[PDB]
């Protein structure tokens, strides 16, 4: 049985997201580090038993996969697909390796990131680094509770882990990342009731709007997708807030895990390109994506066996 | 099948709500049942990771027949009043049970508010108790309460319906009784005399030897063996409650079991007695003022309505 | 002079008990008053360092005359009923107040049990509320409640009797009112309209600017400048309480001040209005169902009798 | 088969008790063994949810034959003394092991008190150590200790007896050794020299790379592969202990494994060395003063007595 | 203003009590350590802020004082006085220095004890070392809540700290220590109600027995002492449980702080020698003192300025 | 009478440091914000009682003081003095207003910073923003415990608050800030013993090196200063780590409070210009100051009485 990485684990109060590209000639250094990442996680993490909750999920992009490995590839691994809507665009930006590092304290995340990057210096170029923090009662920078309808238990396993559809890569997952910045000035121009209509849930109490008042171009409406067989298509989101007050940067770092990119891409298409009933997701009128990358997060034993 | 959170541990706060369904309110109730898990997530997610909010929803026998057209769970029936020579276990109205737990009362109250907001005009409240942890898991009689609950696999076996009733697998049966205690009488006993009523040491919670443990002690009467030698177990999530001004010192009893027959066997022994015991001595200091039985279906049963 | 714990912060749990003294109950009460500090330590020491148990004991005007001869506190009088054009602040009976707080309800309940056990047959309960923290220090209207309470030296100056009444230095005066809210009406307002009722932003708790704050908003009416230009302040320890099944969503108001005149001035503005404001708009959603005044003596007063 | 809590994590407090069984003590011991799980619950339930009390009970080779008729676990034998050219792994008496862990020492102490109370007059104590967490999971040599323990499925595979000995499935083997350290000699080494003794970086706990890791380093010598190319793993629940007055700075070693052969292989490598290492350098600063081997049966084996 | 040592600080969950004698010729070593002890306490303690709560209170015995210092001695400092009752005895045992180390965790206590003893090695001989631990809800090994009637606030300051009566030593205090071992076998044979009559309070609830039921030879009656002024004489007790289950050692480590030894001495005299109304304190029928020592704990500035 | 700002408060797990300049014409907006900052601190902080521990200390620079206020100036207020050593330089950088925001959680800090900067938009220009985090057991990025010798209690009050020497500004303090970046690659090539000789304390245990082995150019030797009266000159440090792993930015944000800037300036002179026995503080061989500013932090009531 393949052991997954920690893709099913819960939100934490601190996170570091690091995205790098692999420099020409840096492949051997990267493969050696991949084989040791679990050992590094334990080395740091054991220090803060029992409440540290340190984990690291490592993802590899399509272009990078083909530079690192030979043989079969995961069935759905491709570069992030840029979505060029009439109004809003989802950009593709460079990224070969993702390290999604979580803990209950930032120091543990920082210590592990330090160890990883120490091993990679001179082999990679950093592309993005975000230090995420919990904001009040699991809110995002738009002031709404964010993560509520994540799947749990068996449903999460079924939504997130590769299975018999791609048996050589069972136990893996696909992660899509996008860094979003928000236009807080425009957002705060809206009444609370108008913001609720953009999201599709009540702001303070986080209760979903009734189907009779929920707009068709609300975020919740557009990201609710059912498959041809009537099943709900779900993803697991580990979004974190971030920002810088003096630069007026207020962001949401989006990261979504799913057993095939087709689920997450369907959601993104609905948001950016719209449906017969909605031109686009109204959340995008206040949110700009500035990065966009797709990664395969292999089963943990795949990494170990390097 | 995914169960509701019937296996989850005791918490520091709880709200127990029992309502009856008004004639005409059935549709509203089915709508609400389909959404209860949603509402739980809406409130609970706000307080990850330490909130530990849960809600277990149960449905009574008469309500079942009013709400659903298909098969009935095999063990589902009205609570059976037990008319003992001295003490009585009353059967009181209740169609729907919401057993709400969290580490803080606010989460319980917020969720209860949302549930009741959806049911207003469809149901009549019968009982509402706000329970609280009392020191080191003590009840209002001063004893640790819940010690011999089953855990892990033993709990699953004792609590969850399985292949004996396969269309309802993952469900469970809850019996509730609200008890009020006569604390004046109880406090007139010595500690040793109280230990003989319960069957355990008061301060340390160690079981009395079989040599010393009276036949009519509570632990003796609620220890039941099956014909296959094995102990019959239930999972109890009792909480204290009360009002000092009204001299109300209570234990809210709630017991979960894979069949009601187990919890009914224990109640029979308590109230009706055995060869060796007229009745459970705990009932000399405890009066049951409610009594209701519910089936708590698997979570996917409620979602699919 | 050692004050009672009138300056201590909000806690997550409280019990408020208000009783009247039966005729012939005086001596039993006096004996209890002399022991209440001892009882608080008896229970509270069990939960050091985090229990934070306290009990503040207050005595009403009529009761004062029944219990004690000699000097009366200068400001002590029965709560004054306020009969406004639309809203009324009722005066209800109460001779003794016990304001019990802790970080856990069990500690409060244990202490209340001890106190009432010592008073049984000498007093009659008038009110009992069990308050709980609601999210991030919110009240049942959904606003952060207590923000502008004074701290440090400013609190001491606002709350404790000093040289103006030297025999009773270190005392304070408490006004209590139990309020029930009309949540259905309140929830009919937009958040922006709610903010204009209160005078602060709802989610972020920032005060509205003076150019937008309505004259009949709550913050506007309860901001009162004294003879010297400075704000007259009180210390509020309001707690939410309620019952979902009875649709009872409440705020237990308790405010401490060095003279009742401050609190009474605020009440008059709220209920009777001013030239600028008909009445406090919070009262269009909030009904007072009790109203009592108490003097809370210095701790050494109680210890000596 | 329900295992005892041999797979559970390190805790901040522990008591290790080793005793021998006196003449005629067998019946008393068998009665205790049947009740030990009940005693754990008695104490443990008091400190839900965070007490994390557990007790693992082990029985030695000679004791097994005195207590039980019928089959013996395949791997149970007396601890094998190893007399190396420089260092010795001593064997000392021990019939019963109690490995008691919790998040607080009180819980461990209370359970140990109850156990020893039942055994008074039937057993002679041989060793008692009260262990405590030291900073960030450090040992008395200043190194993080426990990092490479197996977890999850790998831990089950490494620790629990399976189909190779089916009557005893769910059991495990525990080896204990009390080590005292020469802290003066240790503190005479540079940090970098200490890291070469252990095989990991001192502050950050990162393993030295293979190019730099000495062959007589502790991590090198206790890394063993079976013929399959499989890593042989044990689960260590080591705790620091000591007495400053007596200059007693210790490590209480306890390691669980599915067969004693794994742990014995490691001890042989440490004490007797390999082709490339005379002995483990950790032993130049560490002296074993006890050594015993126990079998820890499945929990239901004990309950069935 | 004299700065006291942490003699007013509350009970903690962990404690080490160390008593040593000063070997011949060890005086200079000890004086240097005394000047450094606050610095050692910060060196260890700062690592664990804000919740470590580490403190160390250093005391010096009467004989040791004369060996260490010339000039003024504190007025109340003398060797502990042996009390030879008809039945029970309070023994006097050697002790020149006391270290009363407290924290929320035993590691901090142990680390600081280690640094202290490492500096005193070869200059001192250990006489006693006890590792105390909190037992449930502030109970002692007899199962009673212990510490309830300790003074707080200004009442504690008045009771504990030397003031104008000995101005050269203002902000000091006096500590008496006794290690007690209990006969738990005998104690656990009593009914709870009989135990309550020994102590003077309710066992489970910790409420004081009323005057009309409390026995004259109960512990609470014998340790309640009114001064000339008709006011209560008070001490501050930081008693901790300790023991070893194999040796049947179940102990109370008594430590009591007071502004003058006369207060603690009066209490001990009542307990061990009794009154007109009581032969002795019934607690002593289940408790044997095996050490007894008296220390002065100077103001912190005294130690640093030597 | 005078209530200080929270300059005596302890270290917390999270901090934001914001330094801004006041734009031409920004003065009135700033004065209005200064009068409201306490109300904003309460608006956010009350939400998180009792464990949020939110505070904000507001400082004003020398040039800004004269732009903002008429009448008396604090006696010690002047621009930060650049120190140009032979090897190392302490740079002076622009800064009119300092907001030192601390809490147990970063969200509270970020929320309050957001409210302050929202009021100042168009009136100020940000110069520096640092989000500090606790690193293990109060360590800095050099791996040493940092803060140990801070004064406490009465000694802190005396070291930090202005008193009768400047009675109009009694209850204020002076803050010096410097953002340091560390050369961790160079630092990590030193043995632990060599690092200990740079700092002047044992790395793991934080015990001070004895006076025989402590190098005269060690950090602790150079920042140990006695006044003419023989007494130690003390400051209160609230230094926090910060960093970005991808940029290899590993920093110490230095902030030191004192009753007069002369104390802190003497320390800086010793560090940067050295003594007869030490060319400069060895810590500076691994640490570069990239900001340097001096602020007066007035009593709370001074800000309010605007
Ligand atoms: C731009 C920043 C984003 C923000 C601030 C945001 C915020 C939210 C919020 C507040 C909710 C409702 C509560 C919850 O269930 O989590 C929500 C739901 C959801 N979001 Fe987003 N979201 C963002 C981007 C995305 C993206 C890019 C996707 C998909 C690619 C996505 C997929 C979802 C899904 C599947 C749900 C659950 C809908 C349901 O089944 O009820 N979100 N998000
Ligand atoms: C006044 C109401 C009740 C009180 C205060 C109470 C209290 C207790 C206490 C103190 C114990 C011993 C510790 C423990 O194992 O939990 C106990 C055990 C138990 N009670 Fe009750 N109980 C009550 C009602 C009931 C009822 C109505 C039932 C069953 C219908 C029940 C079933 C049990 C069971 C099964 C045990 C475990 C006995 C054993 O296996 O040792 N109890 N209860
Ligand atoms: C229905 C009952 C009440 C509710 C729900 C309520 C709620 C609030 C809220 C939300 C605030 C703003 C935040 C704060 O500073 O605490 C506030 C402020 C205040 N309330 Fe009330 N309150 C009630 C009754 C009263 C009463 C009866 C009094 C006085 C007799 C009073 C006096 C004050 C005062 C003095 C302030 C501070 C105003 C300022 O200076 O900004 N409140 N209340
Ligand atoms: C003498 C006292 C002992 C001390 C202080 C000690 C300390 C340590 C330390 C610091 C580590 C490295 C971190 C870790 O992975 O836990 C380690 C690893 C280990 N120790 Fe020891 N140990 C001792 C005795 C033993 C004994 C007696 C055994 C086996 C019979 C043992 C088996 C192991 C194993 C298997 C590892 C993991 C090696 C690896 O796979 O990396 N240790 N020990
Ligand atoms: C590179 C920036 C800095 C780092 C990493 C740093 C680190 C340290 C460390 C590790 C200590 C020893 C433990 C302690 O007592 O806090 C220390 C002490 C000290 N530092 Fe620094 N420091 C730095 C800059 C400064 C600056 C700029 C000053 C003064 C202007 C200063 C003043 C002090 C003082 C007064 C002490 C206490 C000395 C004693 O009395 O023992 N430090 N610092």
Numbering used by the authors:
A (entry chain A), E (entry chain B), F (entry chain C): 7 to 312
B (entry chain F), C (entry chain D), D (entry chain E): 8 to 312
Which sentences from the paper describe this structure?
This work characterizes photocage release of nitric oxide and binding of this ligand to two heme protein systems, cytochrome c′-β and dye-decolourizing peroxidase B using a fixed target sample delivery system. In this work, we describe a thorough characterization of the application of the NO photocage N,N′-bis-(carb­oxy­methyl)-N,N′-di­nitroso-1,4-phenyl­enedi­amine (henceforth referred to as NO cage) to room-temperature microcrystals of two proteins: a gas binding cytochrome c′ (McCP-β) and a dye-decolourizing peroxidase B (DtpB). Laser parameters for photoactivation are systematically explored, and time-resolved structures over timescales ranging from 100 µs to 1.4 s using synchrotron and XFEL beamlines are described. We have demonstrated a sample and time efficient approach using fixed targets to carry out time-resolved SSX and SFX experiments with an NO photocage over the microsecond to second time regimes.
Comparison of these different structures revealed no significant changes in the binding geometry of NO or nearby residues in the heme pocket, meaning that only a two-state transition between unbound and bound states is observed. On binding to the heme, NO was observed to bind in an end-on fashion via the nitro­gen atom with an Fe—N distance of approximately 2.0–2.5 Å and an Fe—N—O angle of approximately 105–150°.
